[PDB]
From Swiss-Prot:
Species of the source: Staphylococcus aureus
Coiled-coil features, chain-numbered ranges: none
Family the entry assigns: Belongs to the type II topoisomerase GyrB family.
Additional detail: Few gyrases are as efficient as E.coli at forming negative supercoils. Not all organisms have 2 type II topoisomerases; in organisms with a single type II topoisomerase this enzyme also has to decatenate newly replicated chromosomes.
High-level lineage: Bacteria, Bacillati, Bacillota, Bacilli, Bacillales
Name of this chain's protein: DNA gyrase subunit B
Span covered, complete protein: 16 to 230 of 644
Role played: A type II topoisomerase that negatively supercoils closed circular double-stranded (ds) DNA in an ATP-dependent manner to modulate DNA topology and maintain chromosomes in an underwound state. Negative supercoiling favors strand separation, and DNA replication, transcription, recombination and repair, all of which involve strand separation. Also able to catalyze the interconversion of other topological isomers of dsDNA rings, including catenanes and knotted rings. Type II topoisomerases break and join 2 DNA strands simultaneously in an ATP-dependent manner.
Subunit: Heterotetramer, composed of two GyrA and two GyrB chains. In the heterotetramer, GyrA contains the active site tyrosine that forms a transient covalent intermediate with DNA, while GyrB binds cofactors and catalyzes ATP hydrolysis.
Compartment(s): Cytoplasm
Length: 192
């Protein structure tokens, strides 16, 4: 019943995306980033992260990295699935992304899963080792949902990231635009 309910959730969000994120215009596109960044900020506020990096990658992928605990990977009694899988298959960003990847650094291990329109492409995999903790999320907004534009606006991201760092003092939040490899722009904010 758990994973059927997952599938129905994805269908619901993709059918009425604007009920979930406000709009499917440029505003809703940028709201994807806010949803993810907000979750990292909660992890900082909980006491466990202090650095968040947002990268606009080639072809308008977004990568958000935090140095928090890493999303848990333990098997849920609820779903019979790893915790990270439950969390990401119930994410609006994931449902509304053509593709999304997560890398978790936790338990001295790097774990990876990928998704399309919220559907996992393979089971969560151990792919390496690590001496850090945190989470990396990379996603590509689905152009079938965001029919006006899937191109992010650096200045829009910059303005809100600046505001978020100012509001959440102590968190280092970095924005980087790598879309043009010949001219990479970065702004990093860190208030007291
Ligand atoms: Cl875990
Ligand atoms: Mg939260």
């Amino acid at each position: 019943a758990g994973q059927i309910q997952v599938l129905e959730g994805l269908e619901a969000v993709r059918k009425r995306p604007g009920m979930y994120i406000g709009s499917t215009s440029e505003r809703g596109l940028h709201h994807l980033v806010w949803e993810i960044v907000d979750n990292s900020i909660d992890e900082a506020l909980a006491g466990y992260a202090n650095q968040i990096e947002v990268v606009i990658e080639k072809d308008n992928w977004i990568k958000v990295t935090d140095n928090g605990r890493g999303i848990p990977v333990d098997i849920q009694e609820k779903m019979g699935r790893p915790a990270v899988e439950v969390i990401l298959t119930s994410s609006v960003v994931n449902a509304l992304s053509q593709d999304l990847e997560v890398y978790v650094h936790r338990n001295e291990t790097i774990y990876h899963q990928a998704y399309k329109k919220g559907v996992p492409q393979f089971d969560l995999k151990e792919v390496g080792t690590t001496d850090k903790t945190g989470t990396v999320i990379r996603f590509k907004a689905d152009g079938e949902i965001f029919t006006e534009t899937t191109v992010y606006n650096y200045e829009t991201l910059q303005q809100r990231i600046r505001e978020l760092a100012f509001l959440n003092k102590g968190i280092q939040i970095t924005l980087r635009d790598e879309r043009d490899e010949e001219n990479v722009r970065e702004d990093s904010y860190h208030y007291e």
